[PDB]
């Protein structure tokens, strides 16, 4: 009845918080992130100690996040779902996109240095 129906809607109210803080906490790390990763740096700071804390706090709110996503979805026989994916899998997926990213940048900096002494080689006088 209502003792049941107030939990099923509680407990999912709690399951968008932690949602909705992972993803705050996401976007100020990529953030962080990108200016530590920015090229511009050499010729541009305890910011460091920050980008750790949300790095940190990442994991620790997906496995908190994880088991009560998890206990509800086998309660209520139902998939939990955030923008049309399973919050879990989103969460995953971001990460290796953002891992694929930073490969990707490194890989073009390489092939492109490459061929810049490639080309110097070639038609350099």
């Known amino acids: 009845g209502a003792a049941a129906l107030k939990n099923y809607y509680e407990v999912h109210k709690e399951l968008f918080e932690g949602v909705q803080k992972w993803e705050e906490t ?34 620790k709110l997906e496995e908190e996040l994880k088991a009560r996503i998890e ?31 930073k490969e990707r940048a490194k890989q073009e900096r390489q092939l492109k240095n490459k061929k810049q002494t490639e080309t110097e080689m070639l038609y350099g006088s």
């Open 26 to 59: 996401w976007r100020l790390f990529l953030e962080f992130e990108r200016k530590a990763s920015d090229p511009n740096r050499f010729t541009n700071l305890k910011e460091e100690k920050q980008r750790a804390k949300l790095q940190k706090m990442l994991p």
């Open 71 to 101: 206990l509800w979805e086998q309660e209520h026989s139902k998939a939990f779902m955030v923008n049309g994916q399973k919050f879990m899998e989103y969460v995953a997926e971001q990460w290796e996109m953002h891992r694929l990213e």
